[PDB]
Enzyme design. Structure first.
Site, PDB file in Angstrom:
ATOM      1  N   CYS A  30       0.816  -1.204   0.000  1.00 42.80           N
ATOM      2  CA  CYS A  30       0.000   0.000   0.000  1.00 42.80           C
ATOM      3  C   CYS A  30       0.856   1.264   0.000  1.00 42.80           C
ATOM      4  O   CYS A  30       1.964   1.275   0.540  1.00 42.80           O
ATOM      5  CB  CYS A  30      -0.900  -0.010   1.254  1.00 42.80           C
ATOM      6  SG  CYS A  30      -0.337  -1.145   2.581  1.00 42.80           S
ATOM      7  N   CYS A  33       0.948   2.850   3.756  1.00 47.80           N
ATOM      8  CA  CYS A  33       1.775   2.034   4.626  1.00 47.80           C
ATOM      9  C   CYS A  33       3.230   2.510   4.588  1.00 47.80           C
ATOM     10  O   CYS A  33       3.808   2.825   5.625  1.00 47.80           O
ATOM     11  CB  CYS A  33       1.624   0.569   4.212  1.00 47.80           C
ATOM     12  SG  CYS A  33      -0.120   0.019   4.231  1.00 47.80           S
TER      13      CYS A  33
END
Length: 104
Positions: A30, A33
């Site tokens: 992601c 993240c």
């Protein structure tokens, strides 16, 4: 300097070998993240009283079970080797206040 632990006991070890420990249970595909790390790095510099580590769910699934990681990204602060605070979604600002609370 956020710490990256790839072992299950090493993760649990960090939790118990310190009064306050903040670890981000996060996962490798992601944008946020990875994006939350840069701010996390800044927080680790002033908050150096609190220990910052990183533990992925893929390499150490056992870790997920230890804290029953259900919602990611999850940021939890550990006091005296246990749970103390939980933060949903990785936000620089949300963590700023969360990390600031115990770490300031």
């Amino acid at each position: 300097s956020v710490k990256i632990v790839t072992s299950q006991s090493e993760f649990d070890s960090i939790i118990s070998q310190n009064e306050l420990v903040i670890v981000d249970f996060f996962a490798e595909w992601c944008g946020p993240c990875k994006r939350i790390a840069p701010f996390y790095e800044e927080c680790s510099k002033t908050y150096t009283k609190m220990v910052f580590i990183k533990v992925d769910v893929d390499e150490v699934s056992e870790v997920t079970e230890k804290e029953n990681i259900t919602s990611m990204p999850t940021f939890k602060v550990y006091k005296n080797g246990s749970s103390v605070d939980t933060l949903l979604g990785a936000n620089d600002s949300a963590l700023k206040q969360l990390i600031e609370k115990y770490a300031a």
